[PDB]
Nucleic acid binder design. Structure first.
Ligand SMILES: [Mg+2]
Lengths: 104, 114, 55, 67, 98
RNA sequence: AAGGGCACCACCAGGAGUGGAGCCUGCGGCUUAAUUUGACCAACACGGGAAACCUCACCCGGCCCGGACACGGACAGGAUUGACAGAUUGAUAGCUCUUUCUCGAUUCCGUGGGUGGUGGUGCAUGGCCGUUCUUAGUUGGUGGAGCGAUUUGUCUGGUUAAUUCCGAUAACGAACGAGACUCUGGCAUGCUAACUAGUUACGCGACCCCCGAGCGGUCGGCGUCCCCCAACUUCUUAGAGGGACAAGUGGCGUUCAGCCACCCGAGAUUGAGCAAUAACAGGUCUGUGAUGCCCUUAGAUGUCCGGGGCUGCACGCGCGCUACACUGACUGGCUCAGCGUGUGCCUACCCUACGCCGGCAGGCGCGGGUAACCCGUUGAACCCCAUUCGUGAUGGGGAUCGGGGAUUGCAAUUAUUCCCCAUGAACGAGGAAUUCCCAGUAAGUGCGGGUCAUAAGCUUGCGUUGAUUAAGUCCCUGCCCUUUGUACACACCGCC
């Protein structure tokens, strides 16, 4: 086994996360695990504002940089065991995955 | 948990690692037709692919230089042993890489062409 | 001098304890998100980290 | 410039000759005429200094005072 | 450099065990990270590798705040006859599994 | 000089102001051992520059080589390195001296040669950035004209925010810029989905009415992803899509390009990012192991340590904060946010709930959070509702200054900051001048981030309350196109 696991995906782009959150749950449906829906956490917007010039002379122009971090949560729940069933990750570069159990 | 840092610091550190590795590879493989670096990280292990033009040149005598750089990137960032692998990849359409063309132009000017 | 005074002055805090992780500068550091990079070096490398301009 | 103090004289060592600060007598009878540093880090090999009012161990940096 | 044999040979055998060595540029670092048990300051290894660079047995690369010294073929036999080791033991980068 | 057009870094009509006072801060000047220095629309809260030490580059002193490598001397009968005591020193720097021990080939001396430098030169340079200029402008190929520099293309006109387009046409065909583009805001009771977001319903409770209601009212009280033991996605989140095109109607218009008005609509102009050719002796060599050349390199312009300085004041200026009060101050009560951060490679330094003590600043235990899980339903301020005050330099204002208590740190003096009790100064709306601005805008008002061991009168963002005036013009200051004049071309700050 009685296992209930959580898989979290996080990256900087939405295309890769969307296709992973698509193909993973599709593999789960074809491999008949009932799937808790993909939950989209609020986006983390890392903002860094910095003077453009390396000198301090100029017209006080500020360059603002953003990093967007997006993360999704998918809970895999089967009456049978899960880890011995699903082993493949199928993860492209640019996205980080973390798999925990309901205990942690 | 307490051992791992937050996601914000983690992504920033990953970007810093990419930038540091890119700077090192640029300063090291300058004459070897360096183009770029692509890192694929997994919890099991990580793979570093060096896009360049002269793969046979970046690889030393029987991979001596690629072994050297693998050990360097091993020690400088302190991965677990055997958890990083360095592959050298030949680029396609080297005329389309601005890095390779700029490096070749710099080499020509250093050689002494007008 | 010997080991007793060469580096004896405390630098456990303050502006003298921090330097840019790239250019070893002590001015205009960015410590947000543990970046620890100089103001100019962050502009230099910000494309590589992933800090990109949107607005 | 015009530094008020003169150029400080850096130390030059005394340029010591052969040590020979121990003697044996009547066809060999050992006489340690120097103090022995008893610590483990000094060991039983090195001798101590023979200053006019104390003894100094070169390695152990122990100073034994006799009053 | 006034650094003694007891850590000169330590640095040299570290450099010969694997074909490279990485050293952060910090003359005030109390201890070099690897060879943790030898009580060697970072300054000693930095100047030793600088001397090896000067004599030509190692080639030097400098990223942001790090040195990436690469041992050379002229370094092979100089380390070998410094350490009095037969030319059968090689650095790890030279020969692997062969 | 003319014609056409345009812009709140221009004006008009106005708003809030600044210039007046106190203070903070940045420049000049003065003084000083030093008050390090760059910069003079497009310098002066700018160098992310809020400096006790560090920073630091300046001043007064004191250490170390962290002078590779080559050569020659030197040496295990010792090249040479450290060090206790006394003086000496600011120093417990064996720095130096008296004094002897101790390391052992790593060094030491000399000659070349390094190396380092927040030293000089931004008028030798790269990169970046500012500006010209965010205006609509810019360029080839082939063809035409001209001996040629050049010109046409790139235009009379209409239109546009736009050389934007319709059209004319010795030009044709293109290219960049504009636009298109990306992010953002406003609409989706339509789709997907949620125990790190909820709503509704139900069931346990707690309290009021219980006269009698009772499917009565409140609950940010507890439960129903605890796995069988409710559903659903409106509200929150974030993806995929749609949605707006001058599309529909009327009028103007060459009835073209377009313009005005209205309906329906969430929306009929949401703000940003990027941003051409050519250039400036514009700024940075004090961001860089970007860098040429010069200077210095052992009594150092390298580096470290101690102290001081960067704050220093007859004075002038700039960016700001606080006010001059009753559209208010004080006291109490009630009631509302959104950005966004949070424990670290070196690197020590996190955000904090709750409980106890103290009057406050704070202190002490117990946790939570590497985070839509905890701070936190971020109980913010202004505002609102009541109290006192009463037109006075007053309960306005809080400068200056005395005494005392904590916190950070190795260290608080020239007061780091915070707290308490005392003093209550100028200031009664500010000359000549001058800045910014058109709708959720100005302004009032607080809250985050950066800087941060300690800290914001700064800056970058966020929300809350929320307007007056205007839908125009070339009058001033400027910009674009055409014609024109020129004795200018370093280009009217010209020339003479
Ligand atoms: Mg009062």
């Amino acid at each position: 086994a009685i296992h209930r696991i959580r898989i979290t995906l996080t990256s900087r782009n939405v295309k890769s996360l969307e296709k992973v959150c698509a193909d993973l749950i599709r593999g789960a449906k074809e491999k008949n695990l009932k799937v808790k829906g993909p939950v989209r956490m609020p986006t983390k917007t890392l903002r860094i504002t910095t003077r453009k010039t390396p000198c301090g002379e100029g017209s006080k122009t500020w360059d603002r940089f953003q990093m967007r971090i997006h993360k999704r949560l998918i809970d895999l729940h089967s009456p049978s065991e899960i880890v011995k069933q699903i082993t493949s990750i199928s993860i492209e570069p640019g996205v980080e995955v973390e798999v925990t159990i309901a205990d942690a | 948990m307490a051992v791992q840092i937050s996601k914000k610091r983690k992504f920033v550190a990953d970007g810093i690692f990419k930038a540091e590795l890119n700077e090192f590879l640029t300063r090291e493989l300058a004459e070897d037709g360096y183009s770029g670096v692509e890192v694929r990280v997994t919890p099991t292990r990580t793979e570093i692919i060096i896009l360049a033009t002269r793969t046979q040149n970046v690889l030393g005598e029987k991979g001596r230089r690629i072994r050297e750089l693998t050990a360097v990137v091993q020690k400088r960032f302190g991965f677990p042993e055997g958890s990083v692998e360095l592959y050298a990849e030949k680029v396609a359409t080297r005329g389309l890489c601005a890095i390779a063309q700029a490096e070749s132009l710099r080499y020509k000017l250093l050689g002494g062409l007008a | 001098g010997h080991q007793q005074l060469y580096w004896s002055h405390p630098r456990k805090f303050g502006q003298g304890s921090r330097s840019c992780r790239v250019c070893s500068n002590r001015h205009g550091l960015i410590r947000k998100y543990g970046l620890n990079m100089c103001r100019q070096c962050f502009r230099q490398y910000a494309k590589d980290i992933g800090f990109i301009k949107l607005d | 410039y015009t530094t008020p103090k003169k150029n400080k004289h850096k130390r030059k060592k005394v340029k010591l000759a052969v040590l020979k600060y121990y003697k044996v007598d009547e066809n060999g009878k050992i006489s340690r005429l120097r103090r022995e540093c008893p610590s483990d880090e000094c060991g039983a090999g090195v001798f101590m200094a023979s200053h006019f009012d104390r003894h100094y161990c070169g390695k152990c940096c122990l100073t034994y005072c006799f009053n | 450099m006034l650094m003694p044999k007891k850590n000169r040979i330590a640095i040299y055998e570290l450099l010969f065990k694997e074909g490279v060595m990485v050293a952060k540029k910090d003359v005030h670092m109390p201890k070099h990270p690897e060879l943790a048990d030898k009580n060697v300051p970072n300054l000693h290894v930095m100047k030793a590798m600088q001397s090896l660079k000067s004599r030509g047995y190692v080639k030097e690369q400098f990223a942001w705040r790090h040195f990436y010294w690469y041992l050379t073929n002229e370094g092979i036999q100089y380390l070998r006859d410094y350490l009095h080791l037969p030319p059968e033991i090689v650095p790890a980068t030279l020969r692997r599994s062969r």
